[PDB]
Write a protein that binds this ligand. Structure first.
Ligand SMILES: COc1ccc(C2(SC[C@H](N)C(=O)O)c3ccccc3CCc3ccccc32)cc1
Ligand SMILES: Nc1ncnc2c1ncn2[C@@H]1O[C@H](COP(=O)(O)OP(=O)(O)O)[C@@H](O)[C@H]1O
Ligand SMILES: [Mg+2]
Length: 332
């Protein structure tokens, strides 16, 4: 019924990466939707994708191109998932979250470094406010490290108080995180405080665990309840859910969820009977995002530099096979 959308976003060279060559090692053609990696010397591999975003691609463009459509399907009542996959330092967190621009030069609302989450949560209150709907928005931020489950929006618990997971009685292909805080967002003003607090707790989590950013998987969920009255006089309810996932660096028990994600994707595309969803917290959590009833997009992030060429290639081969996975999306 529907393929997994795969897009690529390359970042500019960072201060560490040396550009030796006259012309690029990685080229991004947004018209042909291709990436070409130069690796003999006139020798290459070209990969085709659904969208391609080059080094100069601004945040607002990633949002417009990728998320605004997905946010329409969410409002129809589809479950949607976007995950960022790639090497540490390529821009997964910059894409899904973004960064904050110093000393109040921009309201969070206008910040050019703002990423998907903050923009998406702004837009929900604009789109839904005057589309006639009567609605509620609730969000949760969960992170997975060393197969353990940390809640970053819990206002009160020690961040080292980790949560449990069991199979959802009303969804053969999902789970429930017992105790996970779901915060009701009453309007766009409450959004910053909630996300700020979220990012603060993370900092705390970082001090306790080794290389936590790179090894952590982050799952931010927004859920929209929308109720409505039909011409026949009934009461139609639909539940949108959007999963914005920032994955552990492709390069990596610490790695069980990333390993298992690979094994799931491999199984799916090669059409093997057993897809081991159950072998990791992540793949148990996203089971439905990966050959199930969810609309899934991946944003594979890459470097343009020779230093990280091999992880870039890996990341390309890996995201490219994921286009072959078929989901069956369904609403309510
Ligand atoms: C979980 O979702 C989030 C998304 C965006 C923000 C962020 S930037 C967070 C940053 N990537 C970090 O890991 O600390 C931020 C940074 C500092 C202080 C507040 C905020 C809150 C929203 C926001 C708005 C615009 C730009 C960045 C950010 C935080 C959380
Ligand atoms: N698309 C981009 N444009 C400009 N700078 C970027 C881009 N992507 C990443 N960066 C910068 O590269 C660094 C690595 O980003 P980060 O989000 O921490 O990578 P990851 O989460 O993939 O490890 C950050 O300083 C960020 O500011
Ligand atoms: Mg990161």
């Amino acid at each position: 019924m529907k393929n997994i959308q795969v897009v690529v976003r390359c970042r500019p060279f960072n201060l560490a990466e040396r550009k030796a060559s006259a012309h690029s090692i990685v080229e991004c053609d947004p018209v042909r939707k291709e990436v070409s990696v130069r690796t003999d010397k006139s020798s290459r591999k070209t990969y085709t994708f659904d969208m391609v975003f080059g080094a100069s691609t601004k945040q607002i463009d990633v949002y417009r191109s990728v998320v605004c459509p997905i946010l329409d399907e969410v409002i129809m009542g589809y479950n949607c998932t976007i995950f960022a996959y790639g090497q540490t330092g390529t821009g997964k967190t910059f894409t899904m979250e973004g960064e904050r621009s110093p000393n109040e030069e921009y309201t969070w609302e206008e910040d050019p470094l703002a990423g998907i989450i903050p923009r998406t949560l702004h837009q929900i209150f604009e789109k839904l406010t005057d589309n006639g709907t009567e609605f509620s928005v609730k969000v949760s931020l969960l992170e997975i490290y060393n197969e353990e489950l940390f809640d970053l929006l819990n206002p009160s618990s020690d961040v080292s108080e980790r949560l449990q997971m069991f199979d959802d009685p009303r969804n053969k292909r999902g789970v429930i995180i017992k105790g996970l805080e779901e915060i009701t967002v009453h309007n766009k003003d409450e959004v910053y405080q909630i996300l700020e607090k979220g990012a603060a707790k993370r900092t705390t989590a970082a001090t306790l665990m080794n290389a936590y950013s790179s090894r952590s998987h982050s799952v931010f969920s927004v859920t929209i309840h929308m109720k409505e009255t039909t011409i026949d006089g009934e009461e139609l309810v639909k539940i949108g859910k959007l999963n914005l996932v920032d994955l552990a660096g492709s390069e990596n028990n610490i790695n069980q969820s990333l390993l298992t994600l690979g094994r799931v994707i491999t199984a799916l595309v090669e059409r093997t009977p057993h897809v081991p969803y159950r072998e990791s917290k992540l793949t148990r959590i996203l089971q439905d995002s990966l050959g199930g009833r969810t609309r899934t997009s991946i944003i594979a992030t890459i470097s343009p530099a020779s230093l990280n060429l091999e992880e870039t290639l890996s990341t390309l081969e890996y995201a490219h096979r994921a286009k072959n996975i078929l989901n069956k999306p369904e609403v309510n």
